[PDB]
């Protein structure tokens, strides 16, 4: 029948009783319905009530440890269909960890629109294995019924009558006073009324009149103007594929949400525009966006706090952020990589940014698609950027791997001593804060301390290359006071990139990605430098050189640095071809497969191959058968704070003793074939001999034209299988009948032995007696050209011969019948 009452929006009843009564006035649960967090009720703090107006719930129904609930006939005795347009862990009906519930009380529930159902950890619930799901759902695998007292058959089951049309278990039911409805085969799976009649396809659950669209409890396709329609004319949009909501209703939902902001698309008032559509403004039109556009996950009331990497995972697959973020996460190995994976796809932020009280970072670049901060939300005091209470920071965002522009709000750099002044100046310049008639507020008084900001360039004077080393030399560099120089700390890393910077990787507490070498101050002019201690041939490395300098109380620097250079080491021969595999599948087919060199040392021009021919062993015919860098002292070896402090203190002590002495000392006036394979991990060889060994040499080569330099020899031996032409005597058997009874059995050797012949089994059987075995050895065969039957008794002796060898067995030569006569 038609909905008697007015619709009400979804609600989450927790620790409340009046809200439970509110469901009576409700007739349609437009939204989810949560009954949870009741730790104040007892069975003496509840009641029984009937809601005649409620007839349908638009979303899933969640039950969460509701004390005082002994059955399900106390809240809704009229519910019929739980559409579940929204889902909780894929279940459209969730009852999780519900006890004291001895039975259920549904009487009209006969269908589910979509989703699943979860019934778990209910060790006090009954009537949960007596319910069919061929009419309520479309499958039996869309409901989880486990850890139930009725799934063990320990529950007591009773039903009305001995009248219920229902078909331990007796009939399909839900309570002693209620049951399930079974109806004839001329019905459909869109429900059937309790009476025992059928219902139309446009109807859902029970129905007032059998097979009538005009009268239904709920419509599966659509509902509109009092009749079950199958479409929604303008401007009514398809709502949860169950009704039609006019544009006014969708706009009202929009206004009340910002429940998820409601979008209009496909003539449906759906909650989120599918991927591939941009949000046309003032109509919320999901117009097809130009190119693949990740869904925009808006921020509730324009704010999101991030204090752990778990919240940073709530931005995955988004481009636009409606609100402000506060990144204040501290700790964790390789934090920058985590942040890049968490929000590296955030194209823009309509809010402000705060880097207040942050730690375990060395740079602020953890974005790779941002080029503009809108700053629509402003901090009190006209500020859009924030940096507070940070003790370690070596950079800001670079302008050649990241772009940035600011259109509103002042800049803020407070308590950032390692943050050099020049970085602040560059930020002010590129961003444009001064260009748009704005003046920033900074804390430069407490910035630029304990960090080198004045640098000098080092010019390379001589450089050469080898196959595994790179010699470097730079123009003599000395600080104004040569005593400042304490040596150089070179930092190198394997860098294939051509825009390498020292902020790639690491940027966290206890993580590093740059190796370091230490060189002493240049002697007294000798050009300082350093020769690498071996390298990978044909590989490039990024290298630069910093200079240690004596520091004053606040900050003092005489420092100099080098630019990034990508020098490649010449090539050498390559390594062994990994995994040589010569496999056969026939006696004339062998495949030679291999993997490239572990160390290629430049592109491999071709692969060299060699192999030798073999032959059956002769011995078989004469045999009868019837401190060091490898161990390491540091695998990353940075200088510790204690070491730098000791170094500086000793340097200062020395300088002080020198000046002290100077001040008192001085006073003014008073043959094997070969083959070449180019760019292939496979080889085909055909037209081979059967049961023959092949030893194949395999090398790799990186140069062909200037000189032949190849990998060290690699060997693999494959034995072809033997063909079977040796299972029986090949050729006829020469024999003669004598009066001595001696039958000298001659026979020729097969075309090929396929290695060697193990023996020949000869069976002499008078009148077809037991089949005997006679070892015909290789030497005996060669000496007697086969066998020799020295005497036989009179009789029709049948002789069968099997050439037993490694070519196979299981068949004997047909028996020759000779009638011996003495």
């Amino acid at each position: 029948h038609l909905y008697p009452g007015e619709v009400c929006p979804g609600m989450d009843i927790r620790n409340n009783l009046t809200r439970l009564h509110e469901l009576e006035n409700c007739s349609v649960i437009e939204g989810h319905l949560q009954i949870l967090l009741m730790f104040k009720t007892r069975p003496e703090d509840f009641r029984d009530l009937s809601f005649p107006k409620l007839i349908m719930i638009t979303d899933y129904l969640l039950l969460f440890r509701v004390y005082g609930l002994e059955s399900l006939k106390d809240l809704f005795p009229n519910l019929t269909v739980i559409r579940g347009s929204r889902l909780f862990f894929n279940y459209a009906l969730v009852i999780f960890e519900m006890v004291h519930l001895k039975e259920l009380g549904l009487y009209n529930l006969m269908n589910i629109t979509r989703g699943s159902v979860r019934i778990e950890k209910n060790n006090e619930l009954c009537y949960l294995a007596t319910i069919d799901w061929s009419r309520i759902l479309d499958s039996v695998e869309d409901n989880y019924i486990v850890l139930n007292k009725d799934d063990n058959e320990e529950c007591g089951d009773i039903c009305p009558g001995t009248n219920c049309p229902a078909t331990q278990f007796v009939e399909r039911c839900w309570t002693h006073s209620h049951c399930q409805k079974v109806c004839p085969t001329i019905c459909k799976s869109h429900g059937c009324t309790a009476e025992g009649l059928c219902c139309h396809s446009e109807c859902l659950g029970n129905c007032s009149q059998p097979d009538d669209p005009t009268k239904c409890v709920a419509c599966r396709n659509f509902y509109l103007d009092g009749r079950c329609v199958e479409t929604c004319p303008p401007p009514y949009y398809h709502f949860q594929d169950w009704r039609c909501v006019n544009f006014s209703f969708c706009q009202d939902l929009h206004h009340k949400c910002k429940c998820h902001q409601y979008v209009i698309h496909n003539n449906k008032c759906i909650p989120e525009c599918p991927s591939g559509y941009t949000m046309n403004s003032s109509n919320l039109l999901c117009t097809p966006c130009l190119g693949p556009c990740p869904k925009v996950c808006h921020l509730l009331e324009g704010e999101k706090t991030i204090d752990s990497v778990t919240s940073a995972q709530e931005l995955r697959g988004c481009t636009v952020i409606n609100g402000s973020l506060i990144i204040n996460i501290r700790g964790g190995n390789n934090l920058a990589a985590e942040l890049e994976a968490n929000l590296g796809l955030i194209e823009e932020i309509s809010g402000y940014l705060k880097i207040r009280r942050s730690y375990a970072l060395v740079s602020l670049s953890f974005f790779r698609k941002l080029r503009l901060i809108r700053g629509e939300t402003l901090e009190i005091g006209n500020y859009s950027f924030y940096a507070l209470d940070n003790q370690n920071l070596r950079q800001l965002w670079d302008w050649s791997k990241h772009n940035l522009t600011i259109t509103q709000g002042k800049l803020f750099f407070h308590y950032n001593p390692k943050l050099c002044l020049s970085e602040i100046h560059k930020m002010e310049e590129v961003s444009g804060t001064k260009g748009r008639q704005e003046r920033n507020d900074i804390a430069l008084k407490t910035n630029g301390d304990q960090a080198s900001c004045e640098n000098e360039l080092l010019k390379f004077s001589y450089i050469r290359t080898s196959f595994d080393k790179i010699l470097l030399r730079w123009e003599p560099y000395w600080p104004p006071d040569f005593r400042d120089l304490l040596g150089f700390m070179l930092f190198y890393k394997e860098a294939p990139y051509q825009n390498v910077t020292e902020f790639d990787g690491q940027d966290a507490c206890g993580s590093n990605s740059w190796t370091v070498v230490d060189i002493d101050p240049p002697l007294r002019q000798n050009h300082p430098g350093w020769l690498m201690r071996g390298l990978k041939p044909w590989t490039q490395y990024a290298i630069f050189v910093k200079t240690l300098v004596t520091f004053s109380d606040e900050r003092r620097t005489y420092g100099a640095k080098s630019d990034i250079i990508y020098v490649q080491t010449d090539a050498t021969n390559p390594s062994v071809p990994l995994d040589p595999i010569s496999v056969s599948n026939s006696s004339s087919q062998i495949i030679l497969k291999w993997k490239p060199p572990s160390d290629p040392n430049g592109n491999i021009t071709h692969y060299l191959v060699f192999w030798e021919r073999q032959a059956e062993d002769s011995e078989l015919f004469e045999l009868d058968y019837c401190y060091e860098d490898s161990a390491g002292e540091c695998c990353s070896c940075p200088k510790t704070d204690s070491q730098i402090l000791k170094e500086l203190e000793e340097s200062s002590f020395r300088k002080t003793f020198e000046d002290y002495l100077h001040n008192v000392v001085f006073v003014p006036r008073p043959h094997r074939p070969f083959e070449k394979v180019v760019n292939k991990e496979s080889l085909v060889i055909s037209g081979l001999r059967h049961f023959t060994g092949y030893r194949i040499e395999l090398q790799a080569c990186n140069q062909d034209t200037p000189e032949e330099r190849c990998s060290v020899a690699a060997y693999v031996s494959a034995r072809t299988m033997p063909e079977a032409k040796a299972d029986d005597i090949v050729g006829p058997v020469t024999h003669e009948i004598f009066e001595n009874n001696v039958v000298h059995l001659m026979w020729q050797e097969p075309k090929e032995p396929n290695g060697l012949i193990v023996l020949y089994e000869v069976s002499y059987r008078r009148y077809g007696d037991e089949e005997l075995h006679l070892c015909v050895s290789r030497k005996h065969f060669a000496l007697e050209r086969g066998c020799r039957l020295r005497g036989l008794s009179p009789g029709n002796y049948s002789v069968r011969i099997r050439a037993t060898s490694l070519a196979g067995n299981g068949s004997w030569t047909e028996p020759t019948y000779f009638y011996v006569t003495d």
Partner: peptide, 25 residues
């Protein structure tokens, strides 16, 4: 460099004179 301190200072001052000595304290 171009600065005179320590070893550089003494090796730069001895150049000026080595046959007249220094003032006696």
């Amino acid at each position: 460099n171009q600065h005179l301190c320590g070893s550089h200072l003494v090796e730069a001052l001895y150049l000026v004179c080595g046959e007249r000595g220094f003032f006696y304290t």
